Every structure is written in structure tokens, then in C-alpha cells.
Design a protein around this ligand. Structure first.
Ligand SMILES: *[C@@H]1O[C@H](CO)[C@@H](O[C@@H]2O[C@H](CO)[C@@H](O[C@@H]3O[C@H](CO)[C@@H](O)[C@H](O)[C@@H]3O)[C@H](O)[C@H]2NC(C)=O)[C@H](O)[C@H]1NC(C)=O
Ligand SMILES: *[C@@H]1O[C@H](CO)[C@@H](O[C@@H]2O[C@H](CO)[C@@H](O)[C@H](O)[C@H]2NC(C)=O)[C@H](O)[C@H]1NC(C)=O
Ligand SMILES: *[C@@H]1O[C@H](CO)[C@@H](O[C@@H]2O[C@H](CO)[C@@H](O)[C@H](O)[C@H]2NC(C)=O)[C@H](O)[C@H]1NC(C)=O
Ligand SMILES: *[C@@H]1O[C@H](CO)[C@@H](O[C@@H]2O[C@H](CO)[C@@H](O)[C@H](O)[C@H]2NC(C)=O)[C@H](O)[C@H]1NC(C)=O
Ligand SMILES: *[C@@H]1O[C@H](CO)[C@@H](O[C@@H]2O[C@H](CO)[C@@H](O)[C@H](O)[C@H]2NC(C)=O)[C@H](O)[C@H]1NC(C)=O
Ligand SMILES: *[C@@H]1O[C@H](CO)[C@@H](O)[C@H](O)[C@H]1NC(C)=O
Lengths: 357, 357, 357
């Protein structure tokens, strides 16, 4: 649509793609809670494994239960000394020899065992923590697509330029359907969608400030969201769509035709537009948008606190932009928005080993 | 309601129960961050404990802070050698004897400790992580109910058939209200609802495809949601209800009467139904629904690329109901949708010990 | 607004402040996954470090991947025995000596290393888990504001009495934008608002019960949400606002004027109020509210099961409140709610060390 209509008081808040989808595809992820241990060097490993396999059931038990409830619905003489004493220390040192191995080995098994639990909870946290559907971690999906993400999406329908969008959409969800307390096995059931992107159709979001022109009583009449494919341009009933920043995942596409004037305006012309005054006294002659503020500097007073100055707008402008680069600290008769700022920080740890005696 | 009206163009997207609820019940979970240690074996335990108790405060300090901020508002001669040498290795080995014990005991205490923290954060993750109200993990609800779930639900009003529903609802939440940094004590305050299920009442969500019948311009006129108790059938104002898959958790029940024609239609008859044509050119003739895709295959070609052949229909039917069995790949003109798919995967870890000497 | 209109059937569900906001401020967190280790005492720490630095990549690799995808778019003789024997046990014990140290040190480096991963995932869980925008944990904000929470809120705009609110708002979000697998460095980009609290303006939520007065058909006509600055009282279009419990974070303040009758009513007068009867047969004559229930105890028989009694209002009252203090178990012809009740429990762990020999 462009923004010549900006001068008409019509501000474009957003433009987005449109797609039809279905939660038809499906999949299952079967988690193996007890890691695959090496053959027999367990006598040592038995210690930590127990602690682990314990919290494990201390954790999952409830999740399991719920799953159920839901589903239901003398040189010669003394020389003897050297004989014994010598053989003895050998035996002792040997005990100590391997006695240092078990420790050395359990030491490692525990740590590895511990890493796995936090890894596990990090990845399937949602599922581990609730019986209902839940968003899937980026890790989970990936594993599910056996590291071959290119493959999965292609099956799903979207391209890379729709991954985050898809993710945030909250369409790819999963849930715990099985928990073998004895084998320590967890069965999650993912649910993917089959997005089918329409084409060359884009929904466009519209917002309107109280412009004067006709009079400071003016406020153009247009819909909130309109879609269009070619010359057609009808009002889109978004009620049937999940709406991400970039895409619009709709189950259906119900729409409505609009006055000929409306079309005429929204499409290049400005005059066609029909203002009016439903607005109340208290309505604010400015609005926020993408970390910026679009305001009818004529209707009020655009005072810029940082670069001192009044941000005025001559005729033809209809509405000013005011953003990070134009001004740095706006003030619109009552409030004071700060249009710029930063913060940096680092998160890190310093380990401190305590020597011993 | 049934589906004779499917012939009329009235597709029924869903049926759900209805219950009034009140966030009146309440509870408090008081966590003890430092595990109950055994009395005396400490000297060894102090090392790991310190580290843990350290990160504990590193994690909870901020959370603690916010809570405040929020609330404000020679046979004889050489024989001697054997005497000393002997007694000596005895003492030394004995040192090494118990010196191998501490290492063994802390080795254990560390792992147990470490596990408890990831357990702790998995269970009370939301709470530990934000001062506001947050969904309760299944594990926490359970603990709170002292393992006796049957008891709790009984008090909340619901039965097992509503457990998943409730959890999904988001009505059961908790928030931190206490954090003794010295004692290492965390105080969560749970808030449970008091759902009182209405009886024999059921809301039914309706949707409508552009049927022809009257002319390919047709499209029945009916509410989007209607509740009913026996012969009574009015429009439901869902604005006052958390909407779960199987249940509707409302705070009130606001409804409106409908045209006698409407009641006639929705209730068996089909003739009473009054169509119209408010739809626009771009409105798609096929909606989507739980994996399948209902569509007016009369209104557009429904080619199925998998088992080939046009899914057709004719007279009396109204709309096709392309299912997964029926077809594996729809093609409603311009947009091909997968209606079936699958994926499986396994999550498991292979520990890999290292040896010593 | 008060409650003299409570006699008119107008119940006030809530009162909230109003503020303008703009996601203009921005910040960046840069995590260091591998802790700062001590100089050359690694030989020992190398073992656990390996495991840790492994699971790290195991975890972050997908996240790192998605980020890319998105961004692309004989006294003399035997005396000799004592000579060697003695010297030997010395050397041997000494090995055992320091062989007991590495085990002591890695014992620690492990636990520390293990905690930092769960801490890390606890803190930047959302960010680690998804490439899209996600709520920031309290611990992250804190860190970002260098422990100096007061300064931050000052820059953002709200006061301490708006922290809880702000967090809940969900306006403060962050998202990964960089994962240096080699250095093991994560790069989160936070986004904070710049709420500019409007002043003395307040949005008042209104709801109405079917009062009789006129007749058990009455049902006053008033908006759902009205704002008011001084004597002005127009209807608010909350459409443009995030709605917290305490605050209303809007992007704009659209409003509409209301009949002079309306104004007259809402502002003290009761008569001016224009009732009607759009209500259906099935509409309930009582609502729920913050753990209590406002009801027309004249329309239905209000009976308190617990403290027995027939809660009943009287001419001019028009409605009743029924608190926890008032009653414990309310009964509204059909349903019974638990206006009160509690639960308490504790969560804690008991470590059980295993002895050795
Ligand atoms: C490694 O070096 C960093 C330097 O950035 C150290 O960071 C500092 O450590 C303190 C203590 O953990 C951090 O937390 C503090 O917590 C108290 C709560 O009692 C709070 O009042 C302080 O405001 C602060 O948040 C602190 O953020 C941080 N300070 C600075 C100037 O960096 C880190 O501790 C070192 N690693 C280790 C293990 O010591
Ligand atoms: C981990 O702990 C679970 C907890 O039960 C163990 O599972 C039980 O195993 C015993 C013996 O194999 C069975 O009699 C039980 O029926 C199992 N389940 C329950 C609930 O008791 C599991 O064997 C443990 N795994 C390891 C390696 O120790
Ligand atoms: C060294 O040898 C033994 C073994 O430790 C000592 O006798 C006690 O034995 C019991 C049972 O194992 C242990 O609980 C005690 O700790 C041992 N005491 C000591 C001091 O270790 C014996 O007393 C020791 N003798 C020498 C010379 O060190
Ligand atoms: C865990 O760490 C906390 C924080 O350092 C310790 O708390 C201190 O405890 C001492 C003794 O009770 C008090 O005098 C201080 O006032 C406490 N400081 C804070 C900030 O609470 C706590 O004692 C440690 N616990 C253990 C078992 O090590
Ligand atoms: C942690 O693991 C990563 C990946 O396994 C290691 O990264 C490699 O680092 C070497 C140099 O040390 C580079 O030559 C490789 O190209 C890196 N590979 C990848 C995939 O990044 C990293 O070295 C490990 N860090 C430590 C301290 O062991
Ligand atoms: C600690 O005691 C409680 C008793 O209420 C018990 O339930 C719990 O299992 C014990 N802790 C451990 C780790 O067993």
C-alpha cells in the first residue's frame, strides 16, 4: 500500500504474509532416562547411579500418575620381618591401588550422570513438568528431525524464513503419554502442523491518528486489517489466525468487501477517504510503534527534551515520525517517552579450587 | 446438536462442558533449599555444601530482592629399623585409610547435593524465576496435595476427567513471597480455584462454509458459540471464560436469545436456516479442523495427489470432509496440505568412562 | 467511581492505572558458558571439564543452528632390604599422596562445574531453549541492570510499585543472536520498554448483574471499561493495551464519548441509568470475582452451607458480596462454591550417605 496515505492519517502498523495450516502431522519422542552405561565397571558406578535413579523417580512419579488419571478418562628370625612386612605393604598398596580407581571412576560417572539430568530437564522441561500440551524446545524438535532440519521443515511446509515465526506461533506442541517407572522410560507425543503458504497475498495492518486537515476532528475510516492479492483488497477477519510477527497462521480466510470509497483511498487515492469524529476528548493524538512514536505534532506539543526543540510539522506532513535519530527524549503533554537507551552486561563464573593437606 | 445441519453448511467445530469457578482456595508451599544433612559426617561434606549453598544465594538473591520491592508496595641396631619402619607404614596407611573415606563420602554428598538443585529448579522453576503469578508444575501441585491427589481435586470440585483441563486452564498458580537467605528457605504461595461444574449444560462452537444451496452465494447465519440446557438454546458470551480444550472455565454465564428461525435451524430443522452473502471474493471455501480439512469440494477442485482422484460430492452432502484415511495429500486449488505424517526419535545418552593407574 | 451505583446493578470489577510505552530501549547480555578456571591446576580438572564442555555443545548446537537459519533471511645383605623397602614405601606413599589430591580437586571442579550448568539453564532457560523472543527471567534483568535495580526502573519509567506489573506485562523480552561454539559464548539481546505513566488517568472496569428494580428483566447499560481524567469520563478501547493486574500498558489511548445519560449514571446518579433486557434465559444472576462472588441474592436463593443462613440483600442493596468472612461455602441454586479453604506442605530432601571401608 505504501505511505502516501500517511498524509491522510492512515499509518501502516504492519504487513504480514498469510498461510493455511493443519495440525495433522505427528510424531513421538521416546526418552531413555537412565543413560547407557559401560559393561561391568559398575560396582563403583552403583553409588551415584542409585542417587540419580532415585531423584529420577522422585521427579517423574507425579507426572506419571497424572498421565494415568487423564488417560483413564636374630638375622634368620628378623629376616622373616622383611619377608612379611614387604609382602604386606605390597598387598596394602595394591588395595589402595585399586581403591583409588573406584573413586576415580565413580567421580566421573556421577558428574556425567548429573550433567544428563539437567540436560534432560532443560530439553524436555515443559513435558516433564505438565500433562497437557506444551511448546517444544528448539532442542526437542531438532532431535526429532534427527539433526536434519532441512528435511523436517520441508515436510512441515515452511522454509527457513519461517522457522522462528513457526516456533513462536506455538503450533508445534507435545505432551507426556507414557512413563515406565521401572525401565525409566518417557514417552512424549509431538504434534506438528502442515502449513500451506498462500501466495502473493499479504495482510496489512492499519491504524489512524486524529488528523486535522478537514479539522482536528478528523479521523479517517478504514478497517483494522486488510488483505489483498493483486487489485482485490478486502477486510480480513483475523479471528481465525495465530499471528506471529512475520507470518499469519490461519485455519481459514473469512473476509469482507468494503465501501468503494475505502478501496479507492487505501489504494493510492487520498480524497476517497472519509474522516469523522467518534474519538473522545481523552484520546491521545499520537501512538507508539516499533520503539517509536507517531504523533500529530500539530494537535499537541512535540517537545524534544534531549535535542532541545519543538518538533513541529508543516502542512502536508499530517503526522510526524519522531524516532531515535530525529529526537532522543520525547514529551507529549503529560508523559515522557525515552526513545533510546542501552545496557550491557556479562554473566560468568570463576571457580575456586581449595587445595588440601 | 448432531450433524444434519452439516448439510445446511453449519459445521460444528467443537463441544465443551461449562463450570463456574472462583480463585478462592489458597495454599503455601515452604521449600527447604539446604538438604537435611546427617549429623557429624560434615568435615568431608563442608566442601561441596559450600559451593552449592553459594550458587543457591547467587540464584535466589535477585528473586529475593524483588519480592521485597513488590511487597513494600647391627642385628640389635638394625632391628630398630623394623620397629620404626613397621609402626610407620601402619600409621601412614591408616592416614591413607580414612583419607580415602572422606574422598568417598564427599564424592557422594556432592552428587546428591547437585541432583537436588536441578530437581528443585525443575519443580519450582517458574517461581524461582519470577515474582509474579506463574503456572504450577505438576510436581508442585502433587507435593502440595501431599501425594494424595484424589483428596485435593475433591476439594477443588473437579474429578480426574478435568485434571488435564484444569492444568491447561492456568487457573492454578503460585508466586514467591518469602526467601530467608540465611536459613535458605523459600516461600511459595499457591492459589487454587473452586470450580463448580454446571450440569447438563454444554457450549457448542459453530462455524460455516459458503454453501451453495440457495446459490453458491449462500452462507448460513448462526452464532459462533451456543450453550444449551435441554430445549433451551441461546448464544453464549464466551468473553467471560478461560477456554480449555475439554472444558470452559467461566466466571459468569452471559447469554442472549436468538431468532426463532435460528433456534429452529440449529435444533434439527434445516429450512428455518437463513443464509446470505457477506463473504468476499478472497474468502476460502475450505476451513481446517483438528488435522482434517472440511471443504465445499463443489466450490473448488479437491484433487488428492496421494491416492489420486478428485474427492467429489454431490447434492444433499453440502461439504466434503477430507480426512487422513480418505486422502493423504489434499490440493484445494493453490495450496497443497499434508493430512498425514509421522516422525519418531529417541533421546538417550551413552556415558563413556576413562581408566587410570 | 465508588459504589452507590452498586444499588443500580453496576458492579466495579476493577480499577487500574494507565501508561504509554514504547519498546525503544535495548540491551545485550553476553554469557560465558565455560567458567573462568584457575591457572595450571587443570591436569585434574580436565576430566570433568571435558564432560561439561561436551554436554554444552550437545545442548547449544541446535539453538546455534536455528539462529543462523533465521539470520540468513646376612646383616649387611638384608640391611639392604630395609634400604630399598624403606625408600620404596616413601616414593609409593608419595604417589598415593598427590594421587589423593587430583581426586580431591576434580571432586570439587566437578560439582562447581555441575552447578553452573543448572544455574545457567535456570537463568537463561527461555533464551537457551528458543530463537524467538522470550520472557526474561528475573535473574537476567537483575544481572543486566548490574544488581542496580533502582537505576534500571528509573531509566525504564516505572517505580517499584510497577515491577511486578512490568514483569507480568511480558514487555521485557530477550532472544539469542549468537553462539560461538568454539569459545562457548552465548549472545542474548534484551529489549526493555520505556513506559511513560500517564497521570491521574484511571481505567475502571465495569460489569452488571440482572437487577430487578424495574423488574427481574433489568440490566443497566454501561461500557465495560471507562477511563476518566477529572470530570471527563469516556469509554476506553483497551484493544491497544497489555493488561496487567495493577497496570494497563497501552500503545495508544483510543476512546469514545457516551450518552449524557450514561455519564450522569456512572458519575454518582442512579436514575439516569438505562436498563433493558437483552439477557437470555440461561444467564446466571451472579458472578465470580477475586475469590468471592457478587450475586443478586433476590433473584436466586443465596444459602451459606457452612455458617448456615440465607444471605439476603435489601431494597437499595441490589446485589451482595459474600466474602470468606461472610461465608465459607456459598450455594447459588445449582452450584456450591468453596469461598474458602487452604493447603500447606513442605518440599525438602534428606541426604543419606553410604559408608565405605
Ligand atoms: C568472577 O568475577 C566476577 C566479576 O564480574 C564476579 O562477579 C561479582 O560476584 C558477585 C558475587 O557473586 C556478584 O553477585 C553479587 O551478589 C550480591 C548478593 O548478596 C549482590 O548484593 C551484589 O550486588 C552482586 O549481585 C556480582 O554481580 C559480581 N560483581 C561484579 C562487580 O562483578 C564473580 O563473583 C567471580 N566469580 C566468583 C566465583 O567469585
Ligand atoms: C530405578 O528405580 C526404579 C524405581 O522403581 C526401579 O524400578 C523398579 O525395579 C524393580 C526391580 O527391577 C521392580 O520390582 C519395580 O517394579 C520397578 N518399578 C517400581 C515402581 O518399583 C529401577 O529398576 C531402577 N533402575 C536401576 C538401574 O536401579
Ligand atoms: C591403624 O590401624 C587400625 C585401623 O584404622 C587402627 O584401629 C582402629 O580401627 C577401627 C576399625 O577399622 C577404626 O574405626 C579406627 O579409626 C582405627 N583407629 C585409628 C587410630 O586409625 C589402629 O589404632 C591404627 N594404629 C596405628 C598405629 O595407627
Ligand atoms: C549459606 O550462605 C548464606 C549466605 O552467605 C549464609 O548466610 C549467612 O549466615 C550467617 C550465619 O547464620 C549470618 O550471620 C549471615 O547474616 C547470613 N548472611 C545472609 C546473606 O543470609 C548461610 O549461613 C550459609 N549456610 C550454610 C550452611 O553454609
Ligand atoms: C569445547 O568444545 C568445543 C566443541 O567441541 C571445542 O571447540 C573446538 O575448539 C578447537 C580449538 O580449541 C577448534 O580448533 C575447533 O574448531 C572447535 N570446534 C568447534 C566445533 O567449535 C572447544 O575447544 C572445547 N573447549 C574446551 C576448553 O575444551
Ligand atoms: C525426608 O523425610 C520425608 C518425611 O516427610 C520423606 O518424605 C523424604 O523422603 C525424606 N527425604 C529423602 C531424600 O528421602
Amino acid at each position: 500500500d505504501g505511505r502516501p496515505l500517511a498524509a491522510a492519517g492512515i499509518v501502516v502498523t504492519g504487513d504480514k504474509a498469510v498461510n493455511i495450516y493443519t495440525s495433522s502431522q505427528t510424531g513421538s519422542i521416546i526418552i531413555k532416562l537412565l543413560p547407557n552405561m559401560p559393561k561391568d565397571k559398575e560396582a563403583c558406578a552403583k553409588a551415584p547411579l542409585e542417587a540419580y535413579n532415585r531423584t529420577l523417580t522422585t521427579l517423574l512419579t507425579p507426572l506419571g500418575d497424572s498421565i494415568r488419571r487423564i488417560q483413564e478418562s636374630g638375622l634368620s628370625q628378623l629376616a622373616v620381618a622383611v619377608g612379611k612386612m614387604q609382602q604386606f605393604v605390597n598387598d596394602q598398596f595394591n588395595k589402595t591401588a585399586q581403591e583409588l580407581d573406584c573413586i576415580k571412576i565413580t567421580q566421573q560417572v556421577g558428574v556425567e550422570l548429573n550433567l544428563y539430568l539437567t540436560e534432560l530437564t532443560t530439553v524436555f522441561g515443559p513435558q516433564i513438568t505438565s500433562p497437557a500440551l506444551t511448546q517444544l524446545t528448539i532442542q526437542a524438535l531438532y532431535n526429532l528431525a534427527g539433526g536434519n532440519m532441512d528435511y523436517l521443515l520441508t515436510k512441515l511446509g515452511v522454509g527457513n524464513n519461517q522457522l522462528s515465526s513457526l516456533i513462536s506461533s506455538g503450533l508445534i506442541t507435545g505432551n507426556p503419554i507414557l512413563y515406565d517407572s521401572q525401565t525409566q522410560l518417557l514417552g512424549i507425543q509431538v504434534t506438528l502442523p502442515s502449513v500451506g503458504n498462500l501466495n502473493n497475498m499479504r495482510a496489512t495492518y492499519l491504524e489512524t491518528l486524529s488528523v486535522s486537515t478537514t479539522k482536528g476532528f478528523a479521523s479517517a475510516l478504514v478497517p483494522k486489517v486488510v488483505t489483498q492479492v493483486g487489485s482485490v483488497i478486502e477486510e480480513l477477519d483475523t479471528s481465525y489466525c495465530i499471528e506471529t510477527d512475520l507470518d499469519l497462521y490461519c485455519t481459514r480466510i473469512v473476509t469482507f468487501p468494503m465501501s468503494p470509497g475505502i478501496y479507492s483511498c487505501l489504494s493510492g487515492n487520498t480524497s476517497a477517504c472519509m474522516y469523522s469524529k467518534t474519538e473522545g476528548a481523552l484520546t491521545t493524538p499520537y501512538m507508539t510503534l516499533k520503539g517509536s512514536v507517531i504523533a500529530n505534532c500539530k494537535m499537541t506539543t512535540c517537545r524534544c527534551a534531549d535535542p532541545p526543540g519543538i518538533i513541529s510539522q508543516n502542512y502536508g506532513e499530517a503526522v510526524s515520525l519522531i524516532d531515535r535519530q530525529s529526537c532522543n527524549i520525547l514529551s507529549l503533554d503529560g508523559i515522557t517517552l525515552r526513545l533510546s537507551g542501552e545496557f550491557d552486561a556479562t554473566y560468568q563464573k570463576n571457580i575456586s579450587i581449595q587445595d588440601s593437606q
